Amino acid sequence: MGTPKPRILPWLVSQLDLGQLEGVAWVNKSRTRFRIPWKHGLRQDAQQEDFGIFQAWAEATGAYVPGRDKPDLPTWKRNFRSALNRKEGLRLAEDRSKDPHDPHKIYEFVNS
Amino acid sequence: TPKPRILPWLVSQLDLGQLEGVAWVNKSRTRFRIPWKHGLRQDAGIFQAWAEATGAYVPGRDKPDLPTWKRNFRSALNRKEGLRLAEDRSKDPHDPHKIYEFVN
Amino acid sequence: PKPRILPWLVSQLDLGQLEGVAWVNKSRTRFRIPWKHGLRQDAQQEDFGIFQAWAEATGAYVPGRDKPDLPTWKRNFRSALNRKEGLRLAEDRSKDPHDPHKIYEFV
Amino acid sequence: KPRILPWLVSQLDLGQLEGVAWVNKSRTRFRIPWKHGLRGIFQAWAEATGAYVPGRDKPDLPTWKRNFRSALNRKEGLRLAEDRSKDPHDPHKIYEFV
DNA sequence: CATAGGAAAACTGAAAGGGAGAAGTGAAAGTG
DNA sequence: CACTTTCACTTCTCCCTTTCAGTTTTCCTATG
């Protein structure tokens, strides 16, 4: 099925409802707020799949093909943040990215 | 009954005021505005009504086609001596419209 | 009706009235266009020279009727060249610190 | 929002920051005092950008020094010409516009 | 212990930059 | 006539990405 580029919010809601990425989850019964893992790239404990969502999105649009392009976790993170930053209907609700243990951010759908 | 002519039909729809944003724009009623929102806009007239008046569109029978309604309306108006396009505000993000004037 | 952008361009290159808008070969088929990034702290009106000249040619921009919108000028100049048979972008140096420009060729 | 280098030439030409000076004639070389403060042009910068508002914020002179050294670090056409931050007497560093 | 200092590189918001491609246009052929 | 469609273009909206110009974090060693 000749897919059009998915749009970031519809796509991401998928990822939330389906729960297949570790630490990317709805955080409440009403499915209104959600968490995103958000570890800093200079951290020594950091890997690839630390930040799956950023990579996942770079791949959902065709921007990064594993093995064709050089991996660039900084660029993925910044594209994702950037895309969501433009979205009426969405806000950054809680920045816990400097946490030494479960660094993440919480976002919240806001009804128009 | 026969086909309406665009100019008297147009005048009649401006008079009746049943179409939102379609209105005389001065006191002497020789200038007027037509809503002119660009079709690629999510939030997306008289264009349709003229398609309905002329038999070019029947709801049910036809697939809607705002682009062709707008194009036909515009080209029909371009031809008319005695009517000029006075102002193009079709890009404005709040009330995209154009302003015509009956002249002679 | 709107001018076509490619004949207007040759005309503009020949007149040679815009800084860094030039033929860069003898046969006049290769030309350069300045392309500095708007966000650069040394940017102004004539950093968008052919872009404005083009918005004025098509009547989009009337200095005094309209407010400058250089991203839109640049947007529409680039869009008008965007997939044009007969022109290709030979070289993107819009990123150069020194003289950001792009090189285009007639094909 | 002020740009660091135009801003810095403007602090140097104005000469009203203790120990921050043109050290040259062609005005292309300059000093900035660099004491290991462990018991100001760095705060000047932090206030100029809104990073620090005295009263709203906890004073943080190491961060201010950090942000200021890191900004200058990124500018092409500025060079650290002499590091005398480890001189016992007048701890300072010398930069040079190139 | 404690904090301050460094360079390198990751990070950030705001705004410019980009591309795809549907829809926009006037002039003039076409339609009955 | 009296519009409607075709042709040969340009440009606009959607919907993100990337640059700009610093700013922070990391992971350390030095200093107090």
UniProtKB/Swiss-Prot annotation, chain D:
Modification after translation: Constitutively phosphorylated on many Ser/Thr residues. Activated following phosphorylation by TBK1 and IKBKE. Innate adapter proteins, such as MAVS, STING1 or TICAM1, are first activated by viral RNA, cytosolic DNA, and bacterial lipopolysaccharide (LPS), respectively, leading to activation of the kinases TBK1 and IKBKE. These kinases then phosphorylate the adapter proteins on the pLxIS motif, leading to recruitment of IRF3, thereby licensing IRF3 for phosphorylation by TBK1. Ubiquitinated; ubiquitination involves RBCK1 leading to proteasomal degradation. Polyubiquitinated; ubiquitination involves TRIM21 leading to proteasomal degradation. Ubiquitinated by UBE3C, leading to its degradation. Deubiquitinated by USP5 on both 'Lys-48'-linked unanchored and 'Lys-63'-linked anchored polyubiquitin, leading to inhibition of anti-RNA viral innate immunity.
Modified residues (Phosphothreonine): 63
Annotation: DNA-binding region: 1-98
Tissue expression remark: Expressed constitutively in a variety of tissues.
Phosphoserine: residues carrying this PTM: 10, 85
Biased composition (Basic and acidic residues): 79-95
Subcellular location as annotated: Cytoplasm; Nucleus; Mitochondrion
Lineage top rank: taxon: Eukaryota
Disorder named in the UniProt entry: Encephalopathy, acute, infection-induced, 7, herpes-specific: A rare complication of human herpesvirus 1 (HHV-1) infection, occurring in only a small minority of HHV-1 infected individuals. It is characterized by hemorrhagic necrosis of parts of the temporal and frontal lobes. Onset is over several days and involves fever, headache, seizures, stupor, and often coma, frequently with a fatal outcome.
Similarity-based family: Belongs to the IRF family.
Record note on quaternary structure: Monomer. Homodimer; phosphorylation-induced. Interacts (when phosphorylated) with CREBBP. Interacts with MAVS (via phosphorylated pLxIS motif). Interacts with TICAM1 (via phosphorylated pLxIS motif). Interacts with STING1 (via phosphorylated pLxIS motif). Interacts with IKBKE and TBK1. Interacts with TICAM2. Interacts with RBCK1. Interacts with HERC5. Interacts with DDX3X (phosphorylated at 'Ser-102'); the interaction allows the phosphorylation and activation of IRF3 by IKBKE. Interacts with TRIM21 and ULK1, in the presence of TRIM21; this interaction leads to IRF3 degradation by autophagy.
Function: Key transcriptional regulator of type I interferon (IFN)-dependent immune responses which plays a critical role in the innate immune response against DNA and RNA viruses. Regulates the transcription of type I IFN genes (IFN-alpha and IFN-beta) and IFN-stimulated genes (ISG) by binding to an interferon-stimulated response element (ISRE) in their promoters. Acts as a more potent activator of the IFN-beta (IFNB) gene than the IFN-alpha (IFNA) gene and plays a critical role in both the early and late phases of the IFNA/B gene induction.
Identification of the protein by name: Interferon regulatory factor 3
